[model samples]
Target: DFGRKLRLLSGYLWPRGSPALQLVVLICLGLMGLERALNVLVPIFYRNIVNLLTEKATVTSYVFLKFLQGGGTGSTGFVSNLRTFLWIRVQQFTSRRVELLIFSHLHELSLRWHLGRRTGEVLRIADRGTSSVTGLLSYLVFNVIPTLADIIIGIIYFSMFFNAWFGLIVFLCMSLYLTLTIVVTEWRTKFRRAMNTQENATRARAVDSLLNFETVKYYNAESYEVERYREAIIKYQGLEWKSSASLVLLNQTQNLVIGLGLLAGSLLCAYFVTEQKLQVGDYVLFGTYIIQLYMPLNWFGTYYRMIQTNFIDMENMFDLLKEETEVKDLPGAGPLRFQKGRIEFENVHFSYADGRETLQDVSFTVMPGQTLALVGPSGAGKSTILRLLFRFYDISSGCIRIDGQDISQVTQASLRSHIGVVPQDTVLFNDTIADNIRYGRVTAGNDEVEAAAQAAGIHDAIMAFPEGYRTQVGERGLKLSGGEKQRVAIARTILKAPGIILLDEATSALDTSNERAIQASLAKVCANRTTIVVAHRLSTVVNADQILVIKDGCIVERGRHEALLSRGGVYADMWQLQQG
Candidate 1:
């Protein structure tokens, strides 16, 4: 699993990275080699300084020895720092690009995918996955590769100065060290997974609670929300403790392995020096090499564990990218060609994912420049009709057509582009009022925006505010009143000037005066265009060219409003109830 995910991560870098990036990587590796050579020269210069002092060398010899020591040490430090700096920059760029790719893919996923997942949980995965990309690449490039290079050079250095035992010992110790590190890190990975799961749950709970703040207050359940949030935190804390415990064990095991390796090397050096086969300088050199090897060896162990954790975390994000969109255009699908804007539903059957039928054998039609109103109680598939028109969900059976063309056969983007909707609950971004209004038609001019606002009867109200069109609407338009948000939605829809219009309770939230004013505006906009109005208010659809009264997923009555009331069917009953 780790290897597969690692390959997936590197795939993002392989194509997107330019030739210049590869050049930088090569330069970084070359600098690492130079730095390693200079580091080995440090102990040699130290030995020379010691010999010069013992022999009562001249001032020139002392000066020369100091220069060698300083020069080698300083050059090594310079190259190491430069290599690290360059790699960090490259890692940052790679992580940013990967993040953007993930973000775009998430938006491309089906609506069902988003509805089934928590917003906060998905966000958390993307955030951690992108951040881990940088760390994973840094460890792989800087620590892992450099450490391997140093190990090879160190083995050669030992074999040249001392017996082959020195090199053999170093090699055996490294093998053991790596094996132990891998085993322990693999064992700890489960705990990291558990930690991440609990953390995502905690975040989801917190975000859900905050988004429903008003509901919490209405029910006087502040304490209840707090307790629910605390429960998630408690679970997270327990798992976090387990993850931390595993980390402690890993560190202890790594230290033990390095300690034994250093002890063996140091003792071998002392034995050789005691036999007079080697000098004190050789002993010092051997110790310095052991110290240098262990420094990166320790980092190697730590970073390997972090890499495993990061890989597991990023796998969750990768899984999101793997999900296929259920609703997609067919091969060679083209843009919808609107001809008179006529719409027809032919024996359309639809059901929820749970197998509950919402619409069965339902059919309807509206010719160009005609109005069709759907009046039904809640749960009668009123909203589903509008959703089908927009292709939000595929019908279980049958087909829907626009301008004699099956909607399913056309590109969704092109199909939706010719339609306008004023949903019952208007959702707005956390942006200025003008920006929200302009969302319907991105290229609509300022004069056009103001004209649409005036048509929706929101212009005067907006001008009363100090900021007017520039006033910020809070998240989801919560800053505006329900009626105001609906008016803004109406203005936005009007600005779209689509050939077909869908109004789902477009004026339900408004007062009687505003409703009357918006009704007039809607009448003007509906002229010479196909319109579908789904409403519960019978009075709102009184003038519709055709009214369909739906009940239990079937149409029970159809005709003009006065004609249906005279016939005294479900339509009349609903009208009487509303009037009473």
Candidate 2:
């Protein structure tokens, strides 16, 4: 599992810039080699100086050894600093590219996938995965590579300078130390993943609660919301404690193994030195090299732990990438072409994932310059009809066609471009009012935006505010009143000026006065345009070109207002109820 994840992460690195990154790695390794060579020379020169002194050698000998050592020291420092600078640049480039790739893939996922996941969980995964890239690269190159190189070099140096047993001891100790580190770090990963899951749950709970703060206040359930959040936090706390405890255990085991290796190496060196089989300078050199090995060795242990943790953090993000998009454009799909704006649903049957039928054998037709009103009780599948028209979800059977072209056969982007919809619940970004309005048609000018606002009867209200169009709407446009937000939504739809307009209870949020005013504005906007209105208020659709009363996912009655009323059918009963 560890190897697989490392391979996956490495996949991200090469595609960013294999040549550039490879060059950087080679340069870094070369510089490290230069520094290590200089380091090896230092001990040799020191040993020579001590031997020369004991023999009462001349000052010329002392000066020569000192000059060589000083030069090595200066060059080692220079190369190390240069390598550090290049490593930082490479790390930044690698991490940034990985972040962008992940971000782009996220947006490519289908709406169904997005709706099924929590916002907080998705954000947490992306953020942690992106941040882990740098740590992963640093540990792999700086710690793992250097540590392994030093170990191999140390063994060769020991065998050549001392005896084969010295090298054997060092190799065996390192092998054992590494095995223990890998095993313990692997065990600790389970705890880390558990902690991450709990953390996501806790964050999601807090975000959901805050987003519905107004609802909590309305229901006077502040205490209830707090208690819910507290429960999530408690679970997170327990998992975090376990994760921390396991990490401590890993560190303790690593230190113990490392200590055993150091003890064995030191004892072997001491015996050789005492037996007069090795010079005093050889013992000093052995001790110095062992100390140097431990620096990277210690880092190697820590690096293993961090790498495992990062892999766990990145697992969800990778899984997200692997998920197939629920809705996709067909091969060789082309853009939709609109001529008359005609829409038809032919024997459409639809069901959700749970096999619950939402619409069955539903059919409808709206000609160019016609107004088709859908009158139904809540959950009568009125919204489902609109969604089918927009291709938000594919029908279980049958087909929907616009301008005589099957919607499924056309590109989703092109199909949606010709339609404008004002959903029942109008959602807006946390941006300036002008920006939110401009989102309907990104290329629209300021004058066009203002004209749409005036047509929607929202311009006067906007101007009353000190900041006017520049006023910032809070998250999801919660800062605006419901009616104000709906008017803004209408203004946006107006700005789009699409060939087909869908009004899903577009006036449900307004007071009688504004509703009447907006109704008049919509009448003007709907002129000579194909429009579909889903409404509960019968009076609102009284002037519609045709009205259909839907019940139990089927049209029970259909006609103009008076004709349907005269027929004394479902539509007539609904009209009577509303009028009373």
Q: Where does candidate 1 stray beyond 4 Å?
A: 1-7, 15-20, 32-37, 45-65, 75-80, 172-263, 278-280, 303-305, 476-478, 506-509
Candidate 2: tens digits of C-alpha lDDT, residues 415-494: 88889887777776788888888988999889998888877878887777758677777685438777777778888888
Name the candidate that leads on lDDT. Answer: 1
**Clashes per candidate, residues 3 or more apart or on different chains:** 0, 0
- Least accurate 10 contiguous residues by lDDT in model 1: 9-18
Q: lDDT of candidate 1 vs native?
A: 0.78
The positional error of residue 243 in candidate 1, measured at the CA in angstroms, is 12
Candidate 2 TM-score, C-alpha based: 0.79
Each prediction's RMSD over C-alphas, in Å, is 6.8, 7.3
